[PDB]
């Protein structure tokens, strides 16, 4: 998945 933590 596309980076989603920030």
């Amino acid at each position: 998945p596309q980076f989603s933590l920030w």
Partner: single-chain antibody
Framework: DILMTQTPLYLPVSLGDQASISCRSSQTIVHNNGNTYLEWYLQKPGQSPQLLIYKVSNRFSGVPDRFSGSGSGTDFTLKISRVEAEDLGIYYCFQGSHFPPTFGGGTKLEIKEVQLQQSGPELKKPGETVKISCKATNYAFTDYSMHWVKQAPGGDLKYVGWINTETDEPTFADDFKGRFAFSLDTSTSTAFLQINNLKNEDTATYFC?????????????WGQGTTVTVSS
């Protein structure tokens, strides 16, 4: 913004001995989702960093149990029960919980299918421009974002940013706002980092990196790196 203070800067050791390395964050690194994204990397001489421990204490696949990570709050530690020849190199702690992610300054330890292929070393005069490429192999390119990390001459690691491979939207760490640009070419499964007006402070090895954040890992696959030498 979050300082990772890593000690010691140097750790001379004899094989067979124990080694402990510590890292203190200037702020807590628990993520609002409950996870603590503290990772430890080992960079062997002449190689890219490799992930050893993620989420504080979990050993990356294939990493020997001689390595254990512990800690909480603002203090973390990597312990090596018995140092072996293949453990020599530079260790870095890293926090990926709060943007921008940050790396500890490194600890030099010394005796007393996914693949990312980058373009070659470039020797450039200042004021010029360079376009570094990173080709992804063995996973679907647009399924994961592409991250970029800068490793200065003295070895310190700095996060540059990431590009969403589906929306083509980039995000930069404050220190790289302006002369850096990310772009991509899906026909060649390639991500690029372009640097305008080459300056002395740009000399470094730039790494493209793939995360597996949905597995709890931040920097799992690193390219071999691309050295940009600005010979003024």
């Amino acid at each position: 913004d979050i300082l990772m203070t890593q000690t010691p800067l140097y750790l001379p050791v004899s094989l067979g001995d124990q080694a402990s390395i510590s890292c203190r964050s200037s702020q807590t690194i628990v993520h609002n989702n409950g996870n603590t994204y503290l990772e430890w990397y080992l960079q062997k001489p002449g190689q890219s960093p490799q992930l050893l421990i993620y989420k504080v204490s979990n050993r990356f696949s294939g990493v020997p149990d001689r390595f254990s990570g512990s800690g909480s709050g603002t203090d973390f530690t990597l312990k090596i029960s018995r140092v072996e020849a293949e453990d020599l190199g530079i260790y870095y702690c890293f926090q990926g919980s709060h943007f921008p992610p940050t790396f500890g300054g490194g600890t030099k330890l010394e005796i007393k299918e996914v693949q990312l292929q980058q373009s070659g070393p470039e020797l450039k005069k200042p004021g010029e421009t360079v376009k570094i490429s990173c080709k992804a192999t063995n996973y679907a390119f647009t399924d994961y974002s592409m991250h970029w990390v800068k490793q200065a001459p003295g070895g310190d690691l700095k996060y540059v940013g990431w590009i969403n491979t589906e929306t083509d939207e980039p995000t930069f760490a404050d220190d790289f706002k302006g002369r850096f640009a990310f772009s991509l070419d899906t026909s060649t499964s390639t991500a690029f980092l372009q640097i305008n007006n080459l300056k002395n402070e740009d000399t470094a090895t730039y790494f493209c990196v793939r995360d597996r954040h949905d597995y709890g890992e931040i920097f799992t696959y690193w390219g071999q790196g691309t050295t940009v030498t600005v010979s003024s």
